[PDB]
Amino acid sequence: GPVKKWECTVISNDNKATFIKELKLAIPDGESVPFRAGGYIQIEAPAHHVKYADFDVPEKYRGDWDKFNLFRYESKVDEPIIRAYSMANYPEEFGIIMLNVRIATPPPNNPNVPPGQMSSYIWSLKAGDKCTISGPFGEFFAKDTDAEMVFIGGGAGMAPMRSHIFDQLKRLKSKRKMSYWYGARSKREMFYVEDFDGLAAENDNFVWHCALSDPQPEDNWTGYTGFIHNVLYENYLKDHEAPEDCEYYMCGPPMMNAAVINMLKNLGVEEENILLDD
Ligand SMILES: Cc1cc2nc3c(=O)[nH]c(=O)nc-3n(C[C@H](O)[C@H](O)[C@H](O)COP(=O)(O)OP(=O)(O)OC[C@H]3O[C@@H](n4cnc5c(N)ncnc54)[C@H](O)[C@@H]3O)c2cc1C
Ligand SMILES: NC(=O)C1=CN([C@@H]2O[C@H](COP(=O)(O)OP(=O)(O)OC[C@H]3O[C@@H](n4cnc5c(N)ncnc54)[C@H](O)[C@@H]3O)[C@@H](O)[C@H]2O)C=CC1
Ligand code: NA
């Protein structure tokens, strides 16, 4: 009754990184989900059986798949399932839902356990497939203030970061000072580069930076390296006159969230200015 549902068509489902796919969904009749940036939807899947060997993984991203023999895996799901995924589009990107979905493979120290149910299903989807979503939901919303904003994302945590940043600069026409600090493992794992480069070129109040935590020899990389929290500290927060006056929004793997939070507390940032999704 109260929660709305849409039967969507898959527009595309391309790899954006070795272990991340961008699922793009078309909403029926060109309508839009009435969400807020930072929110999420629930995807549901029927019973199914999929093989990793059938995933479309481009050769550019296949290196670690071959290296760890990840095409061995199969996922057998006996009953319908449901999971949450965050919108990577912002609300005025009408008619679509964009998601960034990390494949949850078996842990390497435990390789024979079942692969992740829903991410394996999503990775099997191809253009033209149908996909049912409900919502929207969420609580990871921007504060309505004039404070400087610092966004920290890592890996698939890109999704709500993109939603938030575009919402501020395009829908809200914000003049707030904004920066985005994004951690990727190596150059091929970067994505949405055109999106944020364009925003920074058009908005004097927005800048962004990528740090590579494991740069590869073929990257010819001369930018920032290491964990993103160390890069943000060294190149911006260390010398900030008043880091406690900023609002920090972050989404990354658990160990990135913990390192960022620790660093901000050590700088005297208060918990009300440190925001994560639940
Ligand atoms: C609000 C919210 C927003 C989210 N947004 C996103 C998003 O934007 N993008 C995203 O990628 N995810 C997101 N997530 C996480 C997402 O919902 C899923 O939890 C994730 O995709 C994994 O689900 P799964 O069904 O693929 O894996 P599951 O089936 O839940 O399995 C999880 C992992 O456990 C492993 N495992 C299984 N059995 C065992 C065992 N016996 N021992 C050890 N390990 C085992 C699996 O191989 C897999 O690695 C979000 C979650 C929430 C709550
Ligand atoms: N809860 C939510 O709203 C959302 C959750 N996610 C989750 O985000 C996760 C992202 O994971 P991946 O893409 O595999 O990330 P990853 O392995 O590619 O790492 C991304 C970056 O995180 C940082 N990082 C990683 N390990 C670190 C450590 N030990 N210490 C400090 N920094 C570290 C590095 O800068 C690294 O480049 C996924 O598991 C996904 O489920 C994704 C989107 C939204
Ligand atoms: Na700029």
Author numbering: 128 to 405
Paper excerpt:
In the human pathogen Vibrio cholerae, the sodium-pumping NADH:quinone oxidoreductase (Na+-NQR) generates a sodium gradient by a so far unknown mechanism. Na+-NQR is composed of three integral membrane subunits, NqrB, NqrD, and NqrE, and three hydrophilic subunits, NqrA, NqrC, and NqrF. The six subunits NqrA, B, C, D, E, and F of Na+-NQR harbor a unique set of cofactors that shuttle the electrons from NADH twice across the membrane to quinone. Here we show that ion pumping in Na+-NQR is driven by large conformational changes coupling electron transfer to ion translocation.
